[PDB]
Design a protein around this motif. Structure first.
Motif, PDB file in Angstrom:
ATOM      1  N   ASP A  65       0.814  -1.195   0.000  1.00 13.15           N
ATOM      2  CA  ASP A  65       0.000   0.000   0.000  1.00 13.15           C
ATOM      3  C   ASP A  65       0.861   1.263   0.000  1.00 13.15           C
ATOM      4  OD1 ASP A  65      -2.593  -1.592   0.576  1.00 13.15           O
ATOM      5  OD2 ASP A  65      -1.315  -2.077   2.298  1.00 13.15           O
ATOM      6  N   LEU A  66       1.650   1.443  -1.058  1.00 14.21           N
ATOM      7  CA  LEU A  66       2.515   2.615  -1.178  1.00 14.21           C
ATOM      8  C   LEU A  66       1.716   3.836  -1.624  1.00 14.21           C
ATOM      9  CD1 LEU A  66       4.653   4.363  -3.294  1.00 14.21           C
ATOM     10  CD2 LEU A  66       4.846   4.100  -0.819  1.00 14.21           C
ATOM     11  N   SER A  67       0.953   3.672  -2.701  1.00 14.41           N
ATOM     12  CA  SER A  67       0.143   4.759  -3.242  1.00 14.41           C
ATOM     13  C   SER A  67      -1.008   5.118  -2.308  1.00 14.41           C
ATOM     14  CB  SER A  67      -0.403   4.377  -4.619  1.00 14.41           C
ATOM     15  OG  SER A  67      -1.333   5.339  -5.084  1.00 14.41           O
ATOM     16  N   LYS A  68      -1.394   4.174  -1.462  1.00 11.67           N
ATOM     17  CA  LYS A  68      -2.484   4.397  -0.520  1.00 11.67           C
ATOM     18  C   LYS A  68      -2.231   5.650   0.313  1.00 11.67           C
ATOM     19  CE  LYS A  68      -5.789   1.747   2.125  1.00 11.67           C
ATOM     20  NZ  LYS A  68      -6.875   2.622   1.604  1.00 11.67           N
ATOM     21  N   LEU A  69      -0.957   5.959   0.530  1.00 11.10           N
ATOM     22  CA  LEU A  69      -0.577   7.133   1.306  1.00 11.10           C
ATOM     23  C   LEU A  69      -0.592   8.387   0.437  1.00 11.10           C
ATOM     24  CD1 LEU A  69       0.850   9.150   3.091  1.00 11.10           C
ATOM     25  CD2 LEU A  69       2.980   7.893   2.724  1.00 11.10           C
ATOM     26  N   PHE A  70      -0.376   8.203  -0.863  1.00  5.15           N
ATOM     27  CA  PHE A  70      -0.365   9.322  -1.800  1.00  5.15           C
ATOM     28  C   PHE A  70      -1.769   9.879  -2.011  1.00  5.15           C
ATOM     29  CE2 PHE A  70       3.713   7.568  -3.793  1.00  5.15           C
ATOM     30  CZ  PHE A  70       4.486   8.455  -3.071  1.00  5.15           C
ATOM     31  N   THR A  71      -2.771   9.145  -1.544  1.00  3.92           N
ATOM     32  CA  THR A  71      -4.158   9.567  -1.683  1.00  3.92           C
ATOM     33  C   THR A  71      -4.456  10.770  -0.795  1.00  3.92           C
ATOM     34  OG1 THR A  71      -4.610   7.176  -1.792  1.00  3.92           O
ATOM     35  CG2 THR A  71      -6.501   8.672  -1.941  1.00  3.92           C
ATOM     36  N   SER A  72      -3.753  10.858   0.330  1.00  2.00           N
ATOM     37  CA  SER A  72      -3.942  11.961   1.264  1.00  2.00           C
ATOM     38  C   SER A  72      -3.548  13.288   0.623  1.00  2.00           C
ATOM     39  CB  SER A  72      -3.119  11.731   2.533  1.00  2.00           C
ATOM     40  OG  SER A  72      -3.153  10.368   2.923  1.00  2.00           O
ATOM     41  N   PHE A  74      -3.957  14.264  -2.509  1.00  2.50           N
ATOM     42  CA  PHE A  74      -5.066  14.757  -3.316  1.00  2.50           C
ATOM     43  C   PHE A  74      -6.398  14.505  -2.620  1.00  2.50           C
ATOM     44  CE2 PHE A  74      -7.690  14.425  -7.393  1.00  2.50           C
ATOM     45  CZ  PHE A  74      -7.871  15.794  -7.437  1.00  2.50           C
ATOM     46  N   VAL A  75      -6.582  15.126  -1.460  1.00  2.00           N
ATOM     47  CA  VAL A  75      -7.811  14.966  -0.696  1.00  2.00           C
ATOM     48  C   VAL A  75      -8.597  16.271  -0.637  1.00  2.00           C
ATOM     49  CG1 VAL A  75      -7.026  15.637   1.598  1.00  2.00           C
ATOM     50  CG2 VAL A  75      -8.764  13.853   1.348  1.00  2.00           C
ATOM     51  N   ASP A  76      -7.880  17.388  -0.594  1.00  9.86           N
ATOM     52  CA  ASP A  76      -8.512  18.701  -0.534  1.00  9.86           C
ATOM     53  C   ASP A  76      -7.630  19.761  -1.185  1.00  9.86           C
ATOM     54  OD1 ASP A  76      -9.961  21.161   0.952  1.00  9.86           O
ATOM     55  OD2 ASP A  76     -11.143  19.335   1.264  1.00  9.86           O
ATOM     56  N   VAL A  77      -6.387  19.855  -0.724  1.00 13.50           N
ATOM     57  CA  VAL A  77      -5.444  20.828  -1.261  1.00 13.50           C
ATOM     58  C   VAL A  77      -4.204  20.142  -1.822  1.00 13.50           C
ATOM     59  CG1 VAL A  77      -5.915  23.066  -0.212  1.00 13.50           C
ATOM     60  CG2 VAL A  77      -5.015  21.195   1.191  1.00 13.50           C
ATOM     61  N   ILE A  78      -4.072  20.158  -3.143  1.00 10.81           N
ATOM     62  CA  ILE A  78      -2.933  19.537  -3.805  1.00 10.81           C
ATOM     63  C   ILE A  78      -1.877  20.574  -4.176  1.00 10.81           C
ATOM     64  CG2 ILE A  78      -3.522  19.750  -6.240  1.00 10.81           C
ATOM     65  CD1 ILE A  78      -2.725  16.334  -4.853  1.00 10.81           C
ATOM     66  N   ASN A  79      -1.833  21.665  -3.418  1.00  8.24           N
ATOM     67  CA  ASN A  79      -0.871  22.732  -3.668  1.00  8.24           C
ATOM     68  C   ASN A  79       0.557  22.198  -3.629  1.00  8.24           C
ATOM     69  OD1 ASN A  79      -3.173  24.340  -3.606  1.00  8.24           O
ATOM     70  ND2 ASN A  79      -2.852  24.948  -1.469  1.00  8.24           N
ATOM     71  N   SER A  80       1.471  22.922  -4.266  1.00  6.63           N
ATOM     72  CA  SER A  80       2.874  22.523  -4.307  1.00  6.63           C
ATOM     73  C   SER A  80       3.377  22.153  -2.916  1.00  6.63           C
ATOM     74  CB  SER A  80       3.729  23.650  -4.888  1.00  6.63           C
ATOM     75  OG  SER A  80       2.990  24.855  -4.980  1.00  6.63           O
ATOM     76  N   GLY A  81       3.079  23.002  -1.938  1.00  6.84           N
ATOM     77  CA  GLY A  81       3.510  22.745  -0.577  1.00  6.84           C
ATOM     78  C   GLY A  81       3.097  21.371  -0.086  1.00  6.84           C
ATOM     79  N   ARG A  82       1.838  21.015  -0.320  1.00 15.38           N
ATOM     80  CA  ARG A  82       1.319  19.720   0.103  1.00 15.38           C
ATOM     81  C   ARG A  82       1.903  18.594  -0.747  1.00 15.38           C
ATOM     82  NH1 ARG A  82      -3.720  18.447   3.678  1.00 15.38           N
ATOM     83  NH2 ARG A  82      -3.802  20.387   4.900  1.00 15.38           N
TER      84      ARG A  82
END
Length: 131
Positions: A65-72, A74-82
């Motif tokens: 479940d590597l990508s499972k963490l990448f889901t967080s 793109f949950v609300d704010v996918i800004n550069s910082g995030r």
């Protein structure tokens, strides 16, 4: 554009896990690893307590479940910082959960999913790529 971020994605991935210097990147794909790295290291040093959020339970089976963490990301704010967390995470797992000096089947899990996500997460279009 497109998968170009893949080859470069693994760069920072291996470049951090010390792999005799990954010999699969463009003359410029190397510099990118230098810039991104600066943000990754700074993010890890600066953002440490905030990681208490959910940077453990998911990293228990990140191999399955590597990508499972990448889901967080793109949950609300996918800004550069995030987005930084994306690459920053690769350094946290490569220098804590995955011993360097070898790109064991594990390290691959990161790159295998990193792009698989980033791809559908094409956000890269905005990712720090101007200098």
């Amino acid at each position: 554009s497109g998968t170009y971020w893949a080859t470069l994605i693994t760069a920072f991935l291996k470049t951090v896990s010390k792999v005799e210097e990954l010999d699969c990147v463009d003359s410029a794909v190397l510099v990118d690893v230098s810039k991104i790295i600066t943000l990754t290291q700074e993010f890890r040093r600066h953002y440490d307590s905030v990681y208490r959020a959910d940077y453990g339970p998911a990293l228990k089976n990140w191999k399955r479940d590597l990508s499972k963490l990448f889901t967080s990301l793109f949950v609300d704010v996918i800004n550069s910082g995030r987005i930084v967390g994306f690459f920053d995470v690769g350094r946290y797992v490569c220098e804590e959960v995955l011993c360097p000096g070898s790109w064991t089947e594990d390290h691959e899990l990161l790159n295998d999913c990193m792009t698989h996500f980033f791809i559908e997460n094409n956000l890269m279009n905005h990712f720090p790529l101007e200098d």
